[PDB]
From a paper:
GDP-mannose transport is fundamental for virulence and essential for cell survival, making the transporters attractive targets for inhibitor design.
Vrg4 adopts a very similar pose as that for the GDP-mannose transporter (root mean square deviation ~0.47 Å between 276 Cα atoms), with the binding site open to the luminal side of the Golgi membrane and sealed shut on the cytoplasmic side through the packing together of TM6 & TM7 against TM8 and TM9. Clear mFo-DFc difference electron density was observed for the GMP ligand in three of the eight transporters in the unit cell. In chain C, the phosphate group of the GMP molecule forms a salt bridge with a conserved lysine (K289) on TM9 and interacts with a conserved tyrosine on TM1 (Y28) through a hydrogen bond. Unlike the position of the GMP ligand in chains C and D, the molecule adopts a bent configuration, with the phosphate group now orientated towards the luminal entrance of the binding site. In this position the phosphate now interacts with a conserved serine on TM1 (S32), rather than K289, which adopts a different rotamer configuration compared to chains C and D. However, unlike the GDP-mannose ligand, GMP does not make a direct interaction to the conserved asparagines of the FYNN motif, which are ~4.5 Å away. Analysis of the apo, GMP and GDP-mannose bound structures of Vrg4 show the presence of well−ordered monoolein lipid molecules at a potential dimer interface. Our findings that GMP adopts several similar, yet discrete conformations in the binding site now provides evidence that the slower rate of transport observed for GMP vs. GDP-mannose is due to less effective coupling between the ligand and the transporter.
Author numbering:
A (entry chain E): 18 to 73, 77 to 161, 177 to 333
B (entry chain A): 19 to 73, 77 to 161, 182 to 333
The structure:
Amino acid sequence: ANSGPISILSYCGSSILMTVTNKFVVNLKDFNMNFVMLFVQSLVCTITLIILRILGFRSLNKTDAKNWFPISFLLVLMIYTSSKALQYLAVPIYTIFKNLTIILIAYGEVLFFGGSVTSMELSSFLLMVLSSVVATWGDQQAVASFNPGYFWMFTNCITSALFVLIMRKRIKLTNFKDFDTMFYNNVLALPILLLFSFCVEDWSSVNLTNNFSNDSLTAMIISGVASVGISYCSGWCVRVTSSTTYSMVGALNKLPIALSGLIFFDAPRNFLSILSIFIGFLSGIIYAVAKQKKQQAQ
Amino acid sequence: NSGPISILSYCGSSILMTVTNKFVVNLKDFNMNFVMLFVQSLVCTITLIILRILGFRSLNKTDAKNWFPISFLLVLMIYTSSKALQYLAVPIYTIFKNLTIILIAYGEVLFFGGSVTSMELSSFLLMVLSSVVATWGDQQNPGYFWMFTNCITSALFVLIMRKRIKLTNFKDFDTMFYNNVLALPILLLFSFCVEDWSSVNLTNNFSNDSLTAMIISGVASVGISYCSGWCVRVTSSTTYSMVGALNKLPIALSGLIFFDAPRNFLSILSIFIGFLSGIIYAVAKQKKQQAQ
Ligand SMILES: CCCCCCCC/C=C\CCCCCCCC(=O)OC[C@H](O)CO
Ligand SMILES: CCCCCCCC/C=C\CCCCCCCC(=O)OC[C@H](O)CO
Ligand SMILES: Nc1nc2c(ncn2[C@@H]2O[C@H](COP(=O)(O)O)[C@@H](O)[C@H]2O)c(=O)[nH]1
């Protein structure tokens, strides 16, 4: 019923459904306090599941909690490094290193389970690296100006890898089914999200209390409802496919949306940018073949 | 003489010519390019005849008609490459020059059959990555038509030569003599059609001293002349094109060690990326032998 390439279509739809909700349904999703919006998003996911539990799928522990706590902490730290990385580094460049993380994750999966990287798989990762670089090569955007941004990207790559890798390990160890992975991420996320909000954001009743009104709160539940899509499908994808497949599909997801921006809109375009897009598609096609050749072998 | 010996040889004769063109001969950016190559090949032919009568090689009529397309592929290869570079920056010219290694490699499958390893393709992507990064680390349309034409005449040249070499059991020396001899007439046809010949002007431009430079350039080109046909023969049309583009890197790393010119992190990256590419290529050859 739920295994194989079906999960990939879900993560994509829920990413696309979530991409569209933040840029159209929610006008200006560039909030003042990012960690509190995510705390609501995870609270919507939490409330949602308990209602579904009393109409039917998930469990609550003390041993699984002590083993899942690092995953949620990596998750939240993963977002914290990604936010601080993007304050100083332009998105196309951020994508470069975010596509380069696919390579260490792939070789990170070798050191966790054993599935060696096929020669054909590596060509894909080089193609996704190529694709972004050509896409940046087609774009615009003190000594210590570059400097802070590259530190935060290095730490995001390692928490992005340790997050998807160590989650997948504890999933297959405790036979977590999709719903438990979803429940344990959003619930154990609430506490680490609140610690990250108080540590990084400024809480002032005279100022920031007025900034989140009746209308913006409506935005966070709308966004939390959208985030129910991707929340379930990330842990489903990583479970049935791999930590590297999830990393690749996530990198691929951005392309059709960017290609949508090329079809559905009359904004100026670049050959180098249009190239990067089909280079990225060339990347995914080479990857899927790499998968068929691996499966038929053993 | 076979194996990785040809590869070290091609490197030495390239490195020697790079130094000779950049040190011994002051300003080799001459007025008439195909006339310099005609002397360069004129020196290479003379050298072979003296060597034959001291020892070598053969001279035919059937082989000439089959080697003639290879020579024309060469002279046109230079012509498009000159015309490519009139409109395109060197770093980009190299991007496309590296992209030809891919079609040359898949060109060998359609010419001989030895399929492209998945690991071999990674090396070619790494070489493309490297150059794109080297271009991304720099400053500076009709040139693109001529690059599309330099790429195909570079591939048809390297493939058909390696094909006719293996077809007529040409040895290194026969390949050297046939290339240098049959280029002479096609070089002169190309100079007369493209360069401006004026006694009142350009006859003064090639003096006794510049003529001395073209002969110094000719002695240097004997090295790379022998090793190109030796390398393509004992290794491959693809290994030749990889060794050729990889050669540019130690010269680039040389300029960074031996000179105080400005450098960029992107530049140093591209070089070590190119080195990683050679290493990956070296292994894919090892694994290709062990599997097949
Ligand atoms: C601003 C940044 C610009 C960034 C520009 C991109 C840099 C790409 C560098 C390296 C390739 C990635 C590592 C590839 C590792 C080599 C392959 C390898 O390990 O091959 C043996 C393998 O086990 C056989 O399958
Ligand atoms: C403006 C310039 C546009 C060009 C830019 C494109 C850059 C990517 C290059 C080549 C893709 C190669 C496609 C062919 C992939 C075949 C894979 C292969 O040969 O695999 C080995 C085989 O399975 C063993 O049996
Ligand atoms: N697995 C997992 N990933 C999440 C969760 N919520 C959001 N994501 C992350 O959200 C990103 C895609 O979300 P987007 O901003 O496009 O809606 C991915 O990096 C994905 O890992 C969650 O609870 N679990």
